[PDB]
């Protein structure tokens, strides 16, 4: 899931294909919108929700085998993955619905934080070595702005 390509356009589109059973559709839509807003806040990139497969980033929740050659392992383990910039499945973000999706403090994984992380991958970003960075390879819930100086620098170095 490591690429070397970047999007050749800044007006990125995304489509929420389906939803998780853990949260209301309104909460889901809002969580993704806010996740994208983190990246558009520090770059000339924009994110527009669409309802077509022609979208750059197709978002979907799946369980076990879901099309690609990387099935989800169910509870825990892989939480989700996003393919780097490119056509087709590239740029798409998949979330393991066998995981408990929630927000803020408490049990379950924050869909907001995991999505922001995945969108980083969808934009071409690789894992960061900075523990406090959103692109850190390890999930850990914390309060405060998700983007660390390292995340901002990385994304701006691309766009
Ligand atoms: O890192 C990921 O995107 C996925 C997929 C993956 C597995 N190995 C690699 C290697 C390189 C890129 C992606 C992946 N691994 S994951 O275990 O599902 C995972 C996803 C997100 C996060 C994460 C979310 C939010 C914060 I803040 C920090 C890490 C940690 C671990
Ligand atoms: Ca902006
Ligand atoms: Ca795509
Ligand atoms: Ca899993
Ligand atoms: Ca779930
Ligand atoms: Cl659905
Ligand atoms: Cl927010
Ligand atoms: Cl959160
Ligand atoms: Cl932020
Ligand atoms: Zn997948
Ligand atoms: Zn990652």
Coordinates of N, CA and C in Angstrom, one line a residue, residues 77-154:
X77 N -6.8 -6.3 14.7 CA -5.9 -6.5 13.6 C -6.0 -5.4 12.6
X78 N -6.2 -5.7 11.4 CA -6.4 -4.7 10.3 C -7.7 -3.9 10.6
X79 N -7.6 -2.6 10.7 CA -8.7 -1.7 10.9 C -9.3 -1.2 9.6
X80 N -8.4 -1.0 8.6 CA -8.8 -0.4 7.4 C -7.5 -0.2 6.5
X81 N -7.7 0.2 5.2 CA -6.6 0.4 4.3 C -7.1 1.3 3.2
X82 N -6.2 2.0 2.6 CA -6.5 2.9 1.5 C -5.4 2.8 0.4
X83 N -5.8 2.7 -0.8 CA -4.9 2.6 -1.9 C -4.3 4.0 -2.3
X84 N -3.0 4.1 -2.6 CA -2.4 5.4 -3.0 C -3.0 5.9 -4.3
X85 N -2.8 7.2 -4.6 CA -3.3 7.9 -5.8 C -3.1 7.1 -7.1
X86 N -4.2 7.2 -7.9 CA -4.2 6.5 -9.2 C -5.6 6.2 -9.6
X87 N -5.8 5.7 -10.8 CA -7.1 5.4 -11.3 C -7.7 4.1 -10.7
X88 N -9.0 3.9 -11.0 CA -9.6 2.7 -10.5 C -9.8 2.6 -9.0
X89 N -9.4 1.4 -8.5 CA -9.5 1.2 -7.0 C -8.5 2.1 -6.3
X90 N -7.5 2.6 -7.0 CA -6.5 3.4 -6.4 C -7.2 4.7 -5.8
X91 N -6.7 5.0 -4.6 CA -7.3 6.1 -3.8 C -8.5 5.7 -3.0
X92 N -9.1 4.6 -3.2 CA -10.2 4.1 -2.4 C -9.8 3.8 -1.0
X93 N -10.8 4.0 -0.1 CA -10.6 3.7 1.4 C -11.6 2.7 1.9
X94 N -11.1 1.6 2.4 CA -11.9 0.5 2.9 C -11.8 0.4 4.4
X95 N -13.0 0.3 5.1 CA -13.0 0.1 6.5 C -13.6 -1.2 7.0
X96 N -12.9 -1.9 7.9 CA -13.3 -3.2 8.5 C -14.5 -3.0 9.4
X97 N -15.7 -3.3 9.0 CA -16.9 -3.2 9.8 C -17.0 -4.2 10.9
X98 N -16.0 -5.1 11.0 CA -16.0 -6.1 12.1 C -15.4 -5.4 13.3
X99 N -14.9 -4.2 13.1 CA -14.4 -3.4 14.2 C -15.5 -2.6 14.8
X100 N -15.4 -2.2 16.0 CA -16.4 -1.3 16.6 C -16.1 0.1 16.3
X101 N -16.8 0.8 15.5 CA -16.6 2.2 15.1 C -17.4 3.2 16.0
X102 N -16.7 4.1 16.6 CA -17.3 5.1 17.4 C -16.5 6.4 17.2
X103 N -16.6 7.3 18.2 CA -15.9 8.6 18.1 C -15.5 9.0 19.5
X104 N -14.6 9.9 19.7 CA -14.1 10.4 21.0 C -13.7 9.4 21.9
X105 N -13.5 9.7 23.2 CA -13.1 8.8 24.2 C -14.1 7.6 24.3
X106 N -13.6 6.5 24.8 CA -14.4 5.3 25.0 C -13.9 4.1 24.1
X107 N -14.6 3.0 24.3 CA -14.2 1.8 23.5 C -14.5 1.9 22.0
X108 N -13.8 1.1 21.2 CA -14.1 1.2 19.8 C -13.0 2.2 19.2
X109 N -12.9 2.2 17.9 CA -12.0 3.0 17.2 C -12.7 4.3 16.6
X110 N -12.0 5.4 16.7 CA -12.6 6.7 16.2 C -12.6 6.6 14.7
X111 N -13.8 6.6 14.1 CA -13.9 6.6 12.6 C -13.3 7.9 12.1
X112 N -13.4 9.0 12.8 CA -12.8 10.2 12.4 C -11.3 10.2 12.3
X113 N -10.6 9.7 13.3 CA -9.2 9.6 13.3 C -8.7 8.6 12.3
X114 N -9.3 7.4 12.2 CA -8.9 6.4 11.3 C -9.1 6.9 9.9
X115 N -10.2 7.5 9.6 CA -10.5 8.0 8.3 C -9.5 9.1 7.8
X116 N -9.1 10.0 8.7 CA -8.2 11.1 8.4 C -6.9 10.4 8.0
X117 N -6.5 9.4 8.8 CA -5.3 8.6 8.5 C -5.4 8.0 7.1
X118 N -6.4 7.3 6.9 CA -6.6 6.6 5.6 C -6.6 7.6 4.5
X119 N -7.3 8.8 4.6 CA -7.3 9.7 3.6 C -5.9 10.2 3.3
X120 N -5.1 10.2 4.3 CA -3.7 10.6 4.1 C -3.0 9.7 3.1
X121 N -3.3 8.4 3.3 CA -2.7 7.4 2.4 C -3.3 7.6 1.0
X122 N -4.6 7.8 1.0 CA -5.3 8.0 -0.3 C -4.8 9.2 -1.1
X123 N -4.1 10.1 -0.4 CA -3.5 11.3 -1.0 C -2.1 11.1 -1.4
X124 N -1.5 9.9 -1.0 CA -0.1 9.6 -1.4 C 0.9 9.6 -0.2
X125 N 0.4 9.9 1.0 CA 1.3 10.0 2.2 C 1.7 8.6 2.7
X126 N 2.9 8.5 3.2 CA 3.3 7.2 3.8 C 3.4 7.4 5.3
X127 N 3.6 6.3 6.0 CA 3.7 6.3 7.4 C 4.8 7.2 8.0
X128 N 4.5 7.9 9.1 CA 5.4 8.8 9.7 C 6.2 8.1 10.8
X129 N 7.4 8.6 11.1 CA 8.2 8.1 12.2 C 7.9 8.8 13.5
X130 N 7.1 9.9 13.4 CA 6.8 10.8 14.5 C 5.6 10.2 15.3
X131 N 5.8 9.8 16.6 CA 4.7 9.2 17.4 C 3.4 10.0 17.5
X132 N 3.6 11.3 17.6 CA 2.4 12.1 17.7 C 1.7 12.5 16.4
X133 N 2.3 12.0 15.3 CA 1.7 12.3 13.9 C 0.5 11.5 13.6
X134 N -0.4 12.1 12.9 CA -1.6 11.3 12.4 C -1.2 10.1 11.6
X135 N -0.2 10.3 10.8 CA 0.3 9.2 9.9 C 1.2 8.2 10.6
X136 N 1.2 8.2 11.9 CA 1.9 7.2 12.7 C 1.3 5.8 12.4
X137 N 2.0 4.7 12.2 CA 1.5 3.4 11.9 C 0.7 2.7 13.0
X138 N 0.7 3.3 14.2 CA 0.0 2.8 15.4 C -1.2 3.6 15.8
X139 N -2.3 3.0 16.0 CA -3.5 3.8 16.4 C -3.5 4.0 17.9
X140 N -3.9 5.2 18.3 CA -3.9 5.5 19.7 C -4.8 6.8 19.9
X141 N -5.9 6.7 20.6 CA -6.8 7.9 20.7 C -6.2 8.9 21.6
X142 N -6.3 10.2 21.2 CA -5.9 11.3 21.9 C -6.7 12.5 21.5
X143 N -6.8 13.5 22.3 CA -7.6 14.7 22.0 C -6.6 15.7 21.4
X144 N -7.2 16.8 20.8 CA -6.4 17.8 20.2 C -6.3 17.7 18.7
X145 N -5.8 18.7 18.0 CA -5.7 18.7 16.5 C -4.9 17.5 16.0
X146 N -5.5 16.7 15.1 CA -4.9 15.5 14.6 C -3.6 15.7 13.8
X147 N -3.6 16.8 13.0 CA -2.4 17.0 12.2 C -1.2 17.6 13.0
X148 N -0.1 16.8 12.9 CA 1.1 17.2 13.5 C 2.0 18.0 12.4
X149 N 2.9 18.8 12.9 CA 3.8 19.6 11.9 C 4.3 18.6 10.8
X150 N 4.6 17.4 11.2 CA 5.1 16.4 10.2 C 4.1 16.0 9.2
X151 N 2.8 16.0 9.6 CA 1.7 15.6 8.6 C 1.5 16.8 7.7
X152 N 1.5 18.0 8.2 CA 1.3 19.2 7.4 C 2.4 19.3 6.4
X153 N 3.6 19.1 6.8 CA 4.8 19.3 5.9 C 4.7 18.2 4.8
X154 N 4.4 17.0 5.2 CA 4.3 15.9 4.2 C 3.3 16.2 3.1

